């Protein structure tokens, strides 16, 4: 309990709720940062191809890798590479969004705006990438 990052675990159990968000961030970032750092330095040592490792290291890497996964914002990351694959602003320039990052109903209802521009390539763009459903796709192959 004397550990610097363990007592912060106790104080959230004892009190909190009323405690402002700044301290809820200061007492909660520590465990995640420590886990991430340990995972990085422990995975940087082994090899890459899984046909060149022993039995224990395979399971160790498989269990330890999941701490670094990302699931939500993959599209924004991958947008860059598709541009070069196919080829070879300041918010105000966007339509449907005000400077305060809120929707502009006036333009939407008057100018008859078909699509709201979240990211780049919303302007023009023939790459498509249209949303599909996993279950129908799985039923197609079988």
């Amino acid at each position: 309990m004397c550990e610097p990052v363990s007592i912060g675990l106790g104080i959230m159990s004892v009190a909190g709720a009323t405690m402002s968000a700044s301290q809820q961030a200061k007492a909660e970032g520590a465990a995640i940062d420590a886990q991430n750092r340990q995972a990085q330095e422990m995975i940087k040592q082994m090899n890459y191809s899984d046909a060149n490792l022993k039995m224990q290291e395979r399971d160790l890497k498989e269990q330890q890798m999941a701490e670094l996964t990302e699931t939500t914002l993959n599209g924004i990351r991958n947008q860059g590479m598709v541009r070069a694959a196919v080829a070879e602003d300041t918010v105000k320039e966007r339509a449907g969004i005000t400077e305060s990052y809120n929707r502009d109903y006036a333009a939407i209802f008057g100018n008859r705006i078909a699509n709201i521009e979240n990211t780049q390539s919303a302007i023009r763009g023939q790459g498509k990438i249209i949303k599909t459903s996993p279950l129908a796709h799985a039923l197609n192959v079988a």
């Binding site: 939500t72 209802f109 078909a114 990211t119 919303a122």
Partner: peptide
């Protein structure tokens, strides 16, 4: 509780009058 989240869409399609 807690359901799997949903990725942010790239663009939205709307309708009018």
């Amino acid at each position: 509780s807690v359901q799997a989240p949903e990725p942010a869409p790239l663009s939205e399609e709307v309708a009018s009058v």
